[PDB]
Structures are given as structure tokens and as C-alpha cells.
Amino acid sequence: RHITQQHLRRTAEAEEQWKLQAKEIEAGRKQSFLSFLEERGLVNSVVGQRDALDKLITRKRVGFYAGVDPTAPSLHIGHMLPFMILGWAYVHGLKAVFLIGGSTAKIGDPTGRMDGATRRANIANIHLQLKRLGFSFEKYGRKHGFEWEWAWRRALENNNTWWNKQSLKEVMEVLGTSLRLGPMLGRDYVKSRLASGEGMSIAEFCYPIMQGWDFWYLFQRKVQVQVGGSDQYGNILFGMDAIKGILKANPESEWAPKKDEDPDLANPYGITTPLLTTASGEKAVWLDKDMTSCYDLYQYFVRVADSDVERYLKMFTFVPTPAIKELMEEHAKDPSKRVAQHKLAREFVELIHGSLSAEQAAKDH
Amino acid sequence: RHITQQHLRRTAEAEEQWKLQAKEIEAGRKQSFLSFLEERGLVNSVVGQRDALDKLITRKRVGFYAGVDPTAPSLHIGHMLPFMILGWAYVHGLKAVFLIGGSTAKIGDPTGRMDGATRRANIANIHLQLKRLGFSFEKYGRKHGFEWEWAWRRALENNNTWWNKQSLKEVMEVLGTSLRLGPMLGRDYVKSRLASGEGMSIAEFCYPIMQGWDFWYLFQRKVQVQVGGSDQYGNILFGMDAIKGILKANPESEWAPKKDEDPDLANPYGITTPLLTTASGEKAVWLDKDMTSCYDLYQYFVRVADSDVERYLKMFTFVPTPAIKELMEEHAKDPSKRVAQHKLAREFVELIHGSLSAEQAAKDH
Ligand SMILES: N[C@@H](Cc1ccc(O)cc1)C(=O)O
Ligand SMILES: N[C@@H](Cc1ccc(O)cc1)C(=O)O
Numbered sequence: 001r002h003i004t005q006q007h008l009r010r011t012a013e014a015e016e017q018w019k020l021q022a023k024e025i026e027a028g029r030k031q032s033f034l035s036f037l038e039e040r041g042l043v044n045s046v047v048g049q050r051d052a053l054d055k056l057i058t059r060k061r062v063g064f065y066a067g068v069d070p071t072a073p074s075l076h077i078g079h080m081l082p083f084m085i086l087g088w089a090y091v092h093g094l095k096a097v098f099l100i101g102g103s104t105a106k107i108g109d110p111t112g113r114m115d116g117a118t119r120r121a122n123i124a125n126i127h128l129q130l131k132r133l134g135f136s137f138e139k140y141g142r143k144h145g146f147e148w149e150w151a152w153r154r155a156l157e158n159n160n161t162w163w164n165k166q167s168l169k170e171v172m173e174v175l176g177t178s179l180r181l182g183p184m185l186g187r188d189y190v191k192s193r194l195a196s197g198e199g200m201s202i203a204e205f206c207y208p209i210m211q212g213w214d215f216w217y218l219f220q221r222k223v224q225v226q227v228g229g230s231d232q233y234g235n236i237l238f239g240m241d242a243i244k245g246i247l248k249a250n251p252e253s254e255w256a257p258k259k260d261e262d263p264d265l266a267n268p269y270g271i272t273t274p275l276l277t278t279a280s281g282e283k284a285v286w287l288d289k290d291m292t293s294c295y296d297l298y299q300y301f302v303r304v305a306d307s308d309v310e311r312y313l314k315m316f317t318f319v320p321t322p323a324i325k326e327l328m329e330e331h332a333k334d335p336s337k338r339v340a341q342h343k344l345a346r347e348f349v350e351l352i353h354g355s356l357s358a359e360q361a362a363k364d365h
Numbered sequence: 366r367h368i369t370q371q372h373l374r375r376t377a378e379a380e381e382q383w384k385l386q387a388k389e390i391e392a393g394r395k396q397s398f399l400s401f402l403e404e405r406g407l408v409n410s411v412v413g414q415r416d417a418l419d420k421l422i423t424r425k426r427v428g429f430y431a432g433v434d435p436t437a438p439s440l441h442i443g444h445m446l447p448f449m450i451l452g453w454a455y456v457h458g459l460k461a462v463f464l465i466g467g468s469t470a471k472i473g474d475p476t477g478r479m480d481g482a483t484r485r486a487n488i489a490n491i492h493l494q495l496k497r498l499g500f501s502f503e504k505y506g507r508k509h510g511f512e513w514e515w516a517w518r519r520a521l522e523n524n525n526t527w528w529n530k531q532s533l534k535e536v537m538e539v540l541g542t543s544l545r546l547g548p549m550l551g552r553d554y555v556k557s558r559l560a561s562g563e564g565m566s567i568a569e570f571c572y573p574i575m576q577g578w579d580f581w582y583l584f585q586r587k588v589q590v591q592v593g594g595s596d597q598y599g600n601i602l603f604g605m606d607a608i609k610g611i612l613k614a615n616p617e618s619e620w621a622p623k624k625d626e627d628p629d630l631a632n633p634y635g636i637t638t639p640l641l642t643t644a645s646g647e648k649a650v651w652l653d654k655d656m657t658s659c660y661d662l663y664q665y666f667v668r669v670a671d672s673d674v675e676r677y678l679k680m681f682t683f684v685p686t687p688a689i690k691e692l693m694e695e696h697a698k699d700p701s702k703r704v705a706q707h708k709l710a711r712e713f714v715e716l717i718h719g720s721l722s723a724e725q726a727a728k729d730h
Contacts, residue, residue, distance in 0.1 A: 103534055107542070160534070168533040168575075169468055169525070176568030177472070182559060184567070185550070194547060202549070202574065203541030209567065210533075 014151040018061045018093070025058050033057045033092055037271070039321060040314045042085050047226075047236045047270025055264055056224065061151070063095030063223035064271075067159070067214065068130075069105040070122035071114070074288035075129050077300075081273035081315060082227045083133065090134075091141035091318075095153035097223055098130045102160035104211060110189050110204045112231055123158070129287055130156055133352075140351045144318045159214045171213060178245035179209065187234065208238045215239035216246065219268060220255060227271045236270035243268045274315075279305075287352055294353050298361040301345035302338055309340040317347040379516040383426045383458070390423050398422045398457055402636070404686060405679045407450050412591075412601045412635025420629055421589065426516070428460030428588035429636075432524070432579065433495075434470040435487035436479070439653035440494050442665075446638035446680060447592045448498065455499075456506035456683075460518035462588055463495045467525035469576060475554050475569045477596055488523070494652055495521055498717075505716045509683045524579045536578060543610035544574065552599065573603045580604035581611065584633060585620060592636045601635035608633045639680075644670075652717055659718050663726040666710035667703055674705040682712040 024030040034054040037043045046053055056062060066082035068075070083098070090096035102123055108114070134154050142148055184190065187208075193200050215226055216239075226236050244267065247256040257266035276283050285300045286292040292300075304312055309331070313324050331339035342362070350358035389395040399419040402408045411418055421427060431447035433440070448463070455461035467488055473479070499519050507513055549555065552573075558565050580591055581604075591601050609632065612621040622631035641648050650665045651657040657665075669677055674696070678689050696704035707727070715723035 106538060163534045164532070165530075166533055167529070168531055168536050169528045171533050172568045172571060172575075173471060176571060177566045179567040181555075181565045181567060181570050185559075190546075194550075200546045201542045202544040202546060203537045205546050206537060206541060210537075 010150055014061065014093075017151070022058050033089075033094070037085060037088065040088075041311045042081055042088075042273050042315055044230050044272045044274045045233065047233060047240060047272065048267070049264070052264040052267075053225070053269040053271075056267075056269060057094070060224075060265055061094060062225060063097060063153070063218070063221075064089045064225045064227055065097035065099050065157075065218050065223050066227045067099040067101050067104070067211070068126065069101035069109055070119060070126050071105055071108065072126075073118075073122050074125055074286045074291055076283055076287065077285045077316075078229075078276055078283035081276070082229060084315060085227045085271060085273065087137040087141070087318075090137055090152060090154055091146040093149060093151050095155070095222060097155045097157055097218060098134065099214065099218075100127060100130070100156075100158040102158040103163035104159060104207065104214075107203045107207050107210070109211075109235070110193070110200065110207055111234060112189060113193075125288065127156070127158070136351060136354075139355075140318060144320070157218075159210075159217075162217055163210070166213070171209070174246060174250075175209065175213060175216070175242060178249055179242065184208075208235050209242075211235050212239040212242035215268065216243050219243050224267075225269045225271060227273070230272050230275045233270075233272050236272065240268040240270060289353060294349055294357045294361040295364055297352070298345045298349050298358075298365055301348055302341050302365060304341050304344065306335055306340075309344060313340060313344050313347075317344065317351070319343070319347060375515055379426065379458075382516070387423050398454075398459070402450060402453065405453075406676045407446055407453075407638050407680055409595050409637045409639045410598065412598060412605060412637065413632070414629070417629040417632075418590070418634040418636075421632075421634060422459070425589075425630055426459060427590060428462060428518070428583070428586075429454045429590045429592055430462035430464050430522075430583050430588050431592045432464040432466050432469070432576070433491065434466035434474055435484060435491050436470055436473065437491075438483075438487050439490055439651045439656055441648055441652065442650045442681075443594075443641055443648035446641070447594060449680060450592045450636060450638065452502040452506070452683075455502055455517060455519055456511040458514060458516050460520070460587060462520045462522055462583060463499065464579065464583075465492060465495070465521075465523040467523040468528035469524060469572065469579075472568045472572050472575070474576075474600070475558070475565065475572055476599060477554060478558075490653065492521070492523070501716060501719075504720075505683060509685070522583075524575075524582075527582055528575070531578070536574070539611060539615075540574065540578060540581070540607060543614055544607065549573075573600050574607075576600050577604040577607035580633065581608050584608050589632075590634045590636060592638070595637050595640045598635075598637050601637065605633040605635060654718060659714055659722045659726040660729055662717070663710045663714050663723075663730055666713055667706050667730060669706050669709065671700055671705075674709060678705060678709050678712075682709065682716070684708070684712060 021030065025032050031039075032054050034043070034046075034050070034057055064086055066086055068079055086096040086098065100123060105119060105123075106116075134156060138148065138154070184205075185194075190200070190205070212235075226239055228236055247253055247266070250256060251258070255266065257263045285297060287297075301312075301316075310324065310328060313319065313327075314321065319327075327340055327343060333339070345365075346358055346362045349361050353361075386395065390397050396404075397419050399408070399411075399415070399422055429451055431451055433444055451461040451463065465488060470484060470488075471481075499521060503513065503519070549570075550559075555565070555570070577600075591604055593601055612618055612631070615621060616623070620631065622628045650662060652662075666677075666681075675689065675693060678684065678692075679686065684692075692705055692708060698704070710730075711723055711727045714726050718726075
């Protein structure tokens with residue numbers, strides 16, 4: 001009854017806070033969120049106009065989301081950089097949505113290229129890991145630290161929440177009529193797999209459509225930025241162009257920027273993170289304690305190159321940048337003792353497995 | 366309660382009648398249904414092995430269906446040949462399904478290449494025309510004539526009965542994973558429209574998938590033969606190969622031919638009718654009295670070439686073939702008087718607009 005009143009008031013107050021903060025940033029006194037992500041090295045590139053996205057985040061309490069296909073029994077450190085971004089986003093009052101690809105995983109992302117019983121277990125375990133990684137980001141966040149507010153928004157979703165019932169009709173009418181075949185047949189892996197004679201299924205060919213429709217679904221629900229690994233660039237761009245195509249064809253839409261509104265504030269954007277390598281190829285260190293014990297995880301992060309510990313510290317921890325600047329000189333004193341590698345490992349193992357587990361692994365090694 | 370008992374008994378009796386009739390045909394004493402359709406010139410070609418389809422129809426009380434996309438405010442004589450087949454099928458105890466393309470028409474069949482308000486009216490009017498064309502086939506049938514039985518089955522469907530809710534997920538999993546992209550990109554109009562730079566939408570590209578899924582939906586419901594115009598050959602073959610692909614990948618399926626069962630009795634088949642021309646191109650004579658009065662329709666069929674009145678009589682009427690053989694000699698007496706053209710016109714105008722209207726138009730002209 002009157003709860004809509006309280007909630008609406010709170011919303012207004014949040015908007016005020018964001019407008020003041022926006023005056024701070026845009027006048028120069030405070031650093032924008034995108035600039036910060038860059039100084040942490042979590043931004044491999046922006047899908048869309050970079051300054052337009054900085055403008056969006058500064059002017060608007062928007063939402064971010066990253067998706068993982070449960071094609072692994074557990075997460076590994078490779079997935080963490082998008083989530084790091086989400087983490088940051090969350091503790092900065094922006095909405096963070098962790099998405100599990102329940103339906104998309106049954107097809108498999110054909111970039112850059114299984115049984116159900118296994119896949120269901122994978123879904124369950126990763127769902128647990130992200131459910132606890134949320135609260136973990138809250139704890140770890142309020143320690144460095146960020147004051148938890150009522151405006152903070154966190155969400156864990158599984159896309160088959162809507163693919164269990166999403167009509168093919170609606171997808172074809174709303175989105176299918178906007179997408180053009182030629183451009184899609186221009187995609188890299190489509191050219192590759194058609195040239196090789198290996199080919200594809202129609203299901204595989206329609207994967208980026210399904211992912212774009214996840215993006216659209218979350219777009220109607222205040223999520224405007226999609227975050228992913230570098231490899232996902234193509235899928236993210238495709239998403240944006242998809243949503244735009246919808247708006248450009250339903251200009252009367254509840255989400256289309258009707259003049260005189262700034263289009264940069266209504267459009268979708270993307271962020272791609274760097275790619276981690278084991279001095280050779282991509283990434284395998286799990287986050288399931290039963291596959292990678294806390295001692296083994298810690299052990300992995302201890303043995304990080306002296307050349308890399310800076311970027312790694314900026315990307316995999318919440319420690320302030322100045323504390324890193326000083327810690328790196330204090331490390332330069334005697335690099336023999338892994339001064340930085342140890343802070344890194346302890347920080348991350350805490351972020352993943354808890355503070356007690358982290359200090360246990362630390363005292364051990 | 367006990368109504369399932371009565372119905373099941375009736376079903377058994379029908380199966381008996383069909384088995385006896387099948388002994389008649391296969392021993393030679395009676396003509397098969399496919400052979401009959403051929404002697405009427407309604408069979409331009411068979412999609413699948415012809416003798417296998419003859420075998421199917423002879424051994425099994427299967428179902429037929431033809432689809433029309435409401436992209437015209439009314440039907441025209443061009444649509445009639447598939448329906449003629451259906452008509453025959455119906456009056457022979459086989460199931461006949463007339464399908465309106467409520468959803469497919471919103472996309473438009475891209476072979477061999479609009480607003481909603483109009484399209485809805487089109488749907489309504491064609492729905493009326495087919496609803497009355499069914500009862501019309503019953504009347505006209507029991508006049509030549511065929512004894513109406515309890516086993517006779519007739520149906521009028523609109524595919525958005527299931528596209529209003531059909532999940533994209535189910536289509537992709539069941540069918541999308543079987544379809545291969547390369548072959549589809551080999552389709553004629555896809556090569557044509559990609560070469561020209563005109564291109565397509567994804568919705569257009571997925572049209573034959575939707576139509577194949579209509580075929581699959583009706584396939585689960587005892588309909589095994591799809592009938593269409595010659596132009597629809599590609600769409601029908603694609604349908605068959607689609608259904609087969611489903612069965613070949615779900616061999617445990619309720620509809621897959623598990624040995625030792627004859628696959629020819631479990632597979633889908635197609636029939637394509639000839640194409641009508643106005644001595645130049647395709648077909649425009651409507652069946653709506655408000656667009657083509659009974660006098661105008663009759664007038665069209667009166668002026669048919671003497672060279673063509675035989676095939677036209679075999680295809681557009683239920684008159685027995687011998688009655689045509691004699692009527693064509695009685696016509697050869699004095700071709701000046703349109704002896705055959707008149708029987709043709711009267712017959713068809715009766716089949717479409719009623720007996721009284723037919724005799725009115727006849728006495729007029
Ligand atoms: N494509 C991502 C998973 C994903 C699933 C759904 C999305 O909406 C986005 C991303 C991967 O393979 O890791
Ligand atoms: N393709 C047909 C219409 C149709 C629609 C649905 C079907 O399942 C079959 C046919 C036409 O254009 O005339």
C-alpha cells in the first residue's frame with residue numbers, strides 16, 4: 001500500500017546521491033568509474049564509444065551483467081575478471097547481475113571453436129559458487145572498504161528463467177526481422193567452419209541471437225552494460241547492434257530515446273577484460289575447494305612473475321592503488337621474499353574461500 | 366468413462382475396413398489413391414519415393430494437410446488444386462487438414478521472391494472461406510458421390526494456435542541441432558538474395574524452419590503427407606528431411622520406426638500439384654463473391670481453351686473419369702457449343718458458392 005511510497009522516496013534519494021556524485025566527477029573532483037576500471041587494468045576494450053559509456057555511468061545508476069556457460073564443473077580464475085568488474089560495480093552502488101547460461105550451455109558458444117546429467121551438476125555447483133561469491137564481494141568489499149547502502153543491487157540469474165517459456169514468435173518478430181543474414185554469415189567462426197566443411201547446426205548459428213536476447217531481456221530491466229572476456233567482444237557488439245536494431249525499428253518503444261533525450265543515455269554498451277595466460281595459453285586453477293584446495297590456489301598465486309605482480313594485484317584485489325604503489329617499493333627492497341605475491345595470494349584466497357581459510361593457507365605457505 | 370470403449374471399437378472397425386480395402390488394392394482389384402490422384406492430373410510430383418507413398422496410403426489411414434499464408438484478402442482458384450487433393454482425401458476416409466498460416470504470414474514465404482490490420486481481415490475472410498469449403502466438400506462429395514462415414518476426418522487449423530506459445534528452446538534443441546547451416550544456405554532464393562545484395566532478415570531465413578515445425582507438429586498428430594503447389598516443393602522436402610532428422614536423432618522417439626517396423630510407414634511424404642496459368646503467368650479469379658461474382662467466376666471457366674478442358678475437368682471437379690470420357694466425345698460433336706466448358710463451370714461454381722448460386726449463374730450465361 002504505502003510501501004510503494006517509502007520505496008519511491010528511497011529511490012529519489014539515491015538519484016540525488018548519484019546527481020551530486022555526478023557533479024563531483026564531471027567537474028573533476030572525483031574519478032569516474034570507467035577511468036577507475038581502466039587504472040586497474042580490467043578494461044581490455046570498450047564496445048561502443050568509450051567517452052559515451054563514461055558519460056552514461058557517471059550520469060546514470062546503470063546495471064552491469066556477465067554470463068558464464070556451465071560447461072565446466074567449477075569456475076576457474078579465468079572467469080574472474082568480468083566478475084571483478086561486477087564486484088567493483090556492485091560496491092560502487094551500480095547494479096550487478098551474474099548470469100548462468102542454463103540454456104545457452106546446452107548449445108555451446110561457437111566462439112572461438114557433453115551430456116545433460118553432467119551439465120545439471122555443473123549448473124548447481126557454479127550456481128552455489130556465484131551465490132557465495134556475491135556475499136563474498138559484500139564482505140570483502142565492506143573491509144577495504146565500501147559502506148553498504150540501500151541502493152546497492154545484486155542479482156544472480158539463470159537465463160532459462162525466460163528460455164523455458166520464451167516464444168520463438170516474439171523473438172522472430174521483435175528481433176529476427178531486424179537482424180540481417182549477410183552480416184551474421186560474415187562472423188569469423190561462421191566463415192571458418194563453413195570453409196572447413198565442418199559446418200554448423202542452426203542451433204549453433206543462432207547462439208549469438210540467444211545471447212543478444214538475454215542482453216535485451218536484461219536491458220528492459222535497467223541493465224545497460226554487458227561485461228565479458230576479450231573473446232566475447234563479437235558476441236557483445238552483436239548484442240548492442242541487436243538492441244539498437246530493436247529500438248531503431250520500434251521508436252515508440254518504452255525504451256527508445258524519443259527526442260529531446262540524449263541517445264547516449266539510452267543505448268547499450270560493452271566492456272571486455274584482458275585474457276589471462278599461464279605463460280603460454282589461456283586458462284587451469286579451479287575455485288572448487290575439492291578440485292583446488294586453498295593451499296593449491298594460494299600456491300598458484302605465490303609463484304606469479306615479479307614482472308606481472310603489479311597488474312595482477314590491480315586486477316585481482318580490492319586493495320587501493322596507492323597501497324599497491326607503496327607495497328611495490330617495499331617489495332622492490334627484497335624481491336627474494338615474495339612481498340607482493342603473498343599479499344596478492346592472501347587477498348584473493350580470502351575473496352574466494354573466506355578469511356579463515358585464507359589465513360590458514362597463508363600461515364601454511 | 367465407457368465412451369473411450371465405444372470410440373476404440375469404432376476405430377478398430379475403421380482399421381478393419383482399411384485392411385480389407387488394402388487387400389483389394391494391393392491384389393489389383395481396386396485402384397490406389399495415389400494412382401487416382403495421378404489420373405486426375407493433380408500430382409505434379411511426389412516428394413519422397415512415389416511407390417513408398419502409394420504403399421503408405423494403401424496400408425494406412427494417414428492424414429494430409431495444405432497451408433495457405435493469408436497474404437491475400439481472399440482465396441483464388443490458384444490455391445484450389447492442393448485443396449482438391451485434400452477434398453478427395455477427405456471423401457476417401459483419409460484425414461484432411463486445412464492450415465492457415467497465421468504466424469508464417471507475418472514473415473512472408475521468401476519463395477520465390479503489408480500491415481497487421483489488413484492481415485487480420487485476410488485471416489478472418491480466408492478462415493470463413495475454408496470453414497465453408499469443408500462443408501462444401503462434404504455436400505459436393507456426397508452427391509457424386511461418397512457415403513459419409515464416421516471415420517471421415519476434417520480439420521481447419523491456424524498455425525499460431527501453437528506459435529502463440531511454442532518455445533524457441535524446444536525448437537532449437539529438438540530441430541535446430543539437427544539442421545545444418547550449409548545446406549540451407551544452398552537454397553535457391555538464399556543464394557539469389559545474398560548475391561544481389563538485397564539480402565534477408567533472420568526471420569525470412571527461418572521461414573522454412575517454422576513451416577517444417579508446422580509439419581512436425583501435425584506429424585505427431587497422424588498427418589504424414591504435406592500437399593502444396595509446385596513452388597512449395599523445396600519447403601516440403603525441407604520439412605520431410607527435418608522430421609526425419611528428428612527421428613534419426615531421437616530413435617527412441619514415440620514416432621521413430623523401431624525395428625522390426627517398416628520405415629516407409631513411419632516417414633513423411635509430400636505431394637506437389639501443377640501450376641495454373643492465364644496463358645502467360647501464374648494466378649486472378651477470387652472466391653469471395655464480393656470480388657468475383659458468381660457470374661464472373663462462371664464466365665472465367667466458360668472461356669477455357671478447348672485444348673485444356675479435359676485436364677481442367679479432371680482437376681477441378683469430382684465428376685467420374687468415364688463421365689468425362691463420354692462428355693468429351695459428346696463435346697467433340699459440336700465444340701461450337703461449349704458442352705464441356707459449361708459442365709466444368711457449373712460444377713466448380715457449385716463446389717464454391719452453392720448449388721442455387723451455381724444454377725443461377727448457369728441459367729444467366
Ligand atoms: N558466451 C559466454 C556465456 C554467456 C551466456 C549467456 C550470455 O547472455 C552471455 C554470456 C561464454 O561462453 O563464456
Ligand atoms: N508456404 C505457403 C503457406 C504455408 C504456411 C504454413 C505451412 O505449414 C505450409 C504452407 C504459401 O506461401 O502459400
